[PDB]
């Protein structure tokens, strides 16, 4: 933290976050969600991380340079070190990309090493390869050198991302799967974990062996699992949170901004709120069905009547803020809702579906105030405007991604927020082959736009290249966008140090500090 000229700091320095549910795990891994991130950052130190604005920043790499956007080499910083007091290397890092590459680790985010183009991992994935065929080597401990395929200029902004951050392979190896009990976990980051109670709190305390230490104020930070918005807000304004999670309830918010303005920051955010649909079950695998639910829904009503809190309606999937978009907003999205109604009743009619047998399908959507009071926003907008019967199903933040993963859905509630500010951070995951599909999107076209973005040296080429498939995934329909987020939480006046202005919302708890109250 760089603590301003002339703040006075509070003699204890605690922090409690809310953390919007369980995470699925503290390995970096297993992981994909905005929860599980949160609580990565504190614990595993990548090559680079994020500076207090969301530039990408020196981590354990303190200088790199690139040959031809194709050959990086990270040279590490002398004295960055894990928990246990012993060396953080290059070696760690070729250990933690092979396992993350390896099919048997089955990591959501397998694909992040495909985004990057290492070399090797398309065959490595497929099990054709070994693991330790990956394009990246220790030249020595304190350089780490990866090769990629063909030349990414922007490589460099994917690293900040969790799936990347090193593991200790010794506690892996002897503990397995508990490998991340306190007892037995080993960190690089800031903090190490000292309590983890599920579904009741995760206590991280300042790890005095990270290589920036003498900067780090908070000394202790707790993670709370709290999926309910209104309780939340509730245990905010009580005063045993801090930091509200940056999920919203519609029950008090107005009431919140004029209440206690202040504290309600409100910023901007590259995530995506839309309704994923499997695309490859029937009867979603039909396009006219597809593209009736997302004409259908109302986007005026939900953004601005039923949620209103600075949201923007969405036609894409990639926000089209995002560095690097200029996209092309579809005719749909000009048009009234009455003649998207009139075009949506056509489109499912022509699929087969009558009053006698209408359509019916379930709703999925991880437990929230928030999620479910816009899923029977949804039901009713769906049910007046084209007819169709929606059944609501609530799961806990963890099994609803297992669920999306399986594929034992029909449609379900979904967010996707940027792991690095440019475009494939969005399009990758709807890849044929990407681990990040849910969808169970598959389009040689779609596949093929994407590859040629690599194929080209120009960043105009690139984005009317995103933009066509962007296109494309609207074409086909393949998901139904509903809103892009704006960042809104509840931070007490005392936290100092969390600016608003990172897109990506990468927060470190290393970079706040509490000021006397």
Request: glycine fraction near 4%.
């Amino acid at each position: 933290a760089d603590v301003p000229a002339g703040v006075q700091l509070a003699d204890k320095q605690t922090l409690v976050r809310n953390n919007g549910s369980e995470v699925q795990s503290l390995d970096p891994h297993k992981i994909e969600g905005v929860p599980e991130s949160n609580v990565s950052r504190d614990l595993f130190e990548g090559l680079l991380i994020s500076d207090v604005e969301g530039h990408p920043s020196p981590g354990v790499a303190e200088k790199w340079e690139n040959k031809d956007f194709k050959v990086w080499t990270f040279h590490l910083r002398e004295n960055a070190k894990w928990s246990d007091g012993t060396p953080v290397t290059a070696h760690d890092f070729v250990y933690s990309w092979q396992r993350l590459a390896d099919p048997n680790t089955a990591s959501p985010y397998a694909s992040y090493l495909q985004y990057g183009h290492i070399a090797n991992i398309d065959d490595i994935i497929a099990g054709k390869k070994p693991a330790t065929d990956l394009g990246v080597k220790a030249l020595d401990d304190h350089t780490f050198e990866v090769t990629l395929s063909e030349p990414v200029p922007y490589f460099y902004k994917l690293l900040v991302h969790p799936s990347v951050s090193p593991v200790p392979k010794s506690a892996v190896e002897k503990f397995g799967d508990k490998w991340t009990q306190p007892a037995n976990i080993v960190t690089n980051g800031a903090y190490k974990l000292k309590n983890w109670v599920v579904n009741e709190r995760i206590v991280l305390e300042r790890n005095p062996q990270y290589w920036d230490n003498a900067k780090t104020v908070i000394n202790q930070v707790t993670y709370l699992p709290i999926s309910s918005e209104v309780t939340d807000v509730n245990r905010y304004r009580s005063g045993e949170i801090d930091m509200t999670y940056n999920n919203m309830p519609i029950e008090l918010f107005q009431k919140l901004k004029k209440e206690i303005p202040n504290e309600v920051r409100v910023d901007p955010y590259l995530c995506t709120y839309y309704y994923e649909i499997n695309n490859q079950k029937a009867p979603f695998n039909d396009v006219r069905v597809r593209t009736a639910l997302k004409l259908a829904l109302d986007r005026d009503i939900i953004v601005n009547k039923v949620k209103n809190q600075g949201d923007l309606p969405a036609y894409s999937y990639t926000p089209p803020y995002t560095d690097g978009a200029k996209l092309v907003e579809p005719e749909w999205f000009k048009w009234s809702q009455q003649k998207r109604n009139e075009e949506a009743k056509k489109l499912l009619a022509e699929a087969g579906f009558t009053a006698d047998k209408p359509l019916t399908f379930d709703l999925l959507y991880n437990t929230s105030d928030l999620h479910k009071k816009l899923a029977i926003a949804v039901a009713s907008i769906w049910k007046k405007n084209l007819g169709v019967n929606v059944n609501l199903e609530n799961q806990e933040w963890k099994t609803f991604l297992d669920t999306r993963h399986q594929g034992t859905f029909d449609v379900a509630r979904a967010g996707w927020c940027a792991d690095y500010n440019e475009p494939t951070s969005f399009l990758n995951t709807m890849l044929s082959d990407s681990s990040n599909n849910t969808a169970h999107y598959k389009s040689p076209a779609f596949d093929k736009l994407i590859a040629d973005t690599l194929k080209v040296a120009d960043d105009t080429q690139r984005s009317e290249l995103y933009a066509k498939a962007e296109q494309q995934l609207d074409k086909d329909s393949a998901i139904v966008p509903v809103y892009y987020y704006v960042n809104a939480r509840l931070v007490k006046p005392w936290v100092g140090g969390y600016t608003g202005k990172d897109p990506l919302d990468n927060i470190y708890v290393k970079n706040l500090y509490i000021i006397k109250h």
